[PDB]
Amino acid sequence: ASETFEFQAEITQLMSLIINTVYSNKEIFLRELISNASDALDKIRYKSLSDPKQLETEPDLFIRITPKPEQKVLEIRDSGIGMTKAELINNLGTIAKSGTKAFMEALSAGADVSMIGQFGVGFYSLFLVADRVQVISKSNDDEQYIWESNAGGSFTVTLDEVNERIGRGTILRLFLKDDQLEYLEEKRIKEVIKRHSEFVAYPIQLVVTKEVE
Amino acid sequence: ASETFEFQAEITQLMSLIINTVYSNKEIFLRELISNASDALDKIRYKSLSDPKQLETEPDLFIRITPKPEQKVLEIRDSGIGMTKAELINNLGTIAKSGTKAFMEALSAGADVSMIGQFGVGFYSLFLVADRVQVISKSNDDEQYIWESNAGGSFTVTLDEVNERIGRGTILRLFLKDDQLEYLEEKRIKEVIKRHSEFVAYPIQLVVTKEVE
Ligand SMILES: COC1=C2C[C@@H](C)C[C@H](OC)[C@H](O)[C@H](C)/C=C(\C)[C@@H](OC(N)=O)[C@@H](OC)/C=C/C=C(/C)C(=O)NC(=C(C)C1=O)C2=O
Numbered sequence: 001a002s003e004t005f006e007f008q009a010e011i012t013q014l015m016s017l018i019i020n021t022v023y024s025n026k027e028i029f030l031r032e033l034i035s036n037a038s039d040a041l042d043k044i045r046y047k048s049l050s051d052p053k054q055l056e057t058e059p060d061l062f063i064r065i066t067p068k069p070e071q072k073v074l075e076i077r078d079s080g081i082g083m084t085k086a087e088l089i090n091n092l093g094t095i096a097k098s099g100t101k102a103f104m105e106a107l108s109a110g111a112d113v114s115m116i117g118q119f120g121v122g123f124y125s126l127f128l129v130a131d132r133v134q135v136i137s138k139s140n141d142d143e144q145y146i147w148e149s150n151a152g153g154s155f156t157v158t159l160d161e162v163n164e165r166i167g168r169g170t171i172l173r174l175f176l177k178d179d180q181l182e183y184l185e186e187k188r189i190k191e192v193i194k195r196h197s198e199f200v201a202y203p204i205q206l207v208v209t210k211e212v213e
Numbered sequence: 214a215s216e217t218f219e220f221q222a223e224i225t226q227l228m229s230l231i232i233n234t235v236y237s238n239k240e241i242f243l244r245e246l247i248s249n250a251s252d253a254l255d256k257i258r259y260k261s262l263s264d265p266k267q268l269e270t271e272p273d274l275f276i277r278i279t280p281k282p283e284q285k286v287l288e289i290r291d292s293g294i295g296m297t298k299a300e301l302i303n304n305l306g307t308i309a310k311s312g313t314k315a316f317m318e319a320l321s322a323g324a325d326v327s328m329i330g331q332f333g334v335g336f337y338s339l340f341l342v343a344d345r346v347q348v349i350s351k352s353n354d355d356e357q358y359i360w361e362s363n364a365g366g367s368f369t370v371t372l373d374e375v376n377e378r379i380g381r382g383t384i385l386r387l388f389l390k391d392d393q394l395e396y397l398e399e400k401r402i403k404e405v406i407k408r409h410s411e412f413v414a415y416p417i418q419l420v421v422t423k424e425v426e
């Protein structure tokens with residue numbers, strides 16, 4: 001089933017920094033994850049200009065937020081390009097990232113966490129509000145895989161026999177911290193999107209569950 | 214992966230009858246599926262009176278409707294007792310049912326389809342509005358399985374490596390007919406529940422997806 005990999009050292013260090021910070025504007029994590037989703041929709045949409053059959057696995061291009069209050073979990077879905085087993089491994093931890101040290105140096109010098117995205121390491125901002133992540137992803141070029149981290153020194157990557165089938169793309173499964181359940185609520189989610197994600201080319205769907213009156 | 218089984222002969226016959234009928238009150242299929250859900254919630258709730266650890270796999274007791282417009286699919290979820298591989302096989306087709314012939318005889322004599330549930334064969338009413346069903350189920354006593362039918366002479370039962378994990382219970386996955394997509398819409402669903410499912414002990418949740426304004 002399930003392989004384990006080592007985080008490059010500064011990535012550990014940065015995650016540890018973020019997860020431990022008192023910062024007062026953690027809502028930016030959603031700006032980042034939405035903007036990553038958009039970057040991945042862009043990428044597949046562009047790819048299919050020269051290869052239209054790439055869109056076939058999943059014709060609709062969207063971003064979808066799903067609060068799961070009962071599980072203390074928030075999910076950000078996209079029908080973007082997705083990632084293969086080897087891209088999860090390389091790009092999410094094992095290799096040194098061009099901005100990690102520079103950002104941490106900026107941070108300790110006074111910089112706002114908000115700036116994370118400009119150092120190209122804004123995926124790690126999710127730890128502002130979550131102590132476990134699953135990245136579940138299906139690329140047109142591979143089977144569906146689950147990448148998991150708890151901010152420790154290592155992560156796991158497992159063949160997905162367990163979750164619904166993504167036609168194509170990626171789900172970010174955030175297990176929220178108990179002092180961050182504000183991000184489970186419709187009003188809150190809507191506000192953060194309004195404020196920080198006005199200029200997004202793709203529909204952003206919110207999946208909401210109400211008991212029938 | 215995937216075994217195939219034979220429908221007992223009258224069950225085929227009845228399915229063929231239902232799927233082919235012009236009947237003007239097909240909405241009753243939802244009454245039936247909700248009431249089955251309730252029968253399965255009852256059953257686990259009762260079981261755990263003498264065995265409280267049975268509720269642990271899924272503490273919440275609910276029924277959940279999820280329209281999937283993009284897929285022409287409606288899902289009815291319950292956290293009831295669920296079914297094992299052997300119960301799917303026995304109880305959903307292979308063995309002769311006590312009411313099948315009697316109901317078909319009632320039908321051709323004038324009876325309203327609405328009466329199906331009183332012959333204890335109301336599960337088959339789903340074919341009024343669907344030409345494919347998946348029954349995905351997880352019983353505390355077995356792995357999660359998928360039972361599939363297209364109203365033909367046979368059905369399949371496959372180990373589930375493909376759908377999200379039910380802690381416990383059952384999802385009815387209806388693939389609706391093109392002239393029955395009315396059941397994908399919030400207003401419609403709500404109306405049918407109001408009319409036919411007033412007296413239900415369990416919360417009925419409706420999962421709705423709206424694009425953010
Ligand atoms: C230029 O692409 C980006 C990179 C470089 C690569 C990891 C890009 C990645 O390699 C397989 C892919 O092209 C996809 C599109 C990655 C994402 C943008 C994100 O995945 C999502 N959300 O589906 C996203 O993963 C959930 C990417 C995470 C990568 C990191 C660490 C991130 O913070 N910054 C990057 C962003 C925001 C990028 O847009 C980045 O490295």
Ligand SMILES: COC1=C2C[C@@H](C)C[C@H](OC)[C@H](O)[C@H](C)/C=C(\C)[C@@H](OC(N)=O)[C@@H](OC)/C=C/C=C(/C)C(=O)NC(=C(C)C1=O)C2=O
Binds near residue numbers: 253293
């Ligand atoms: C008395 O239980 C019932 C039976 C007899 C058995 C199949 C019961 C079944 O055996 C494994 C289970 O006790 C569960 C609780 C079955 C359901 C009620 C239904 O499953 C759902 N919705 O989770 C439901 O399956 C999705 C049961 C389908 C069974 C048939 C054919 C049905 O139309 N009628 C029955 C109903 C409505 C029952 O309530 C029935 O046979």
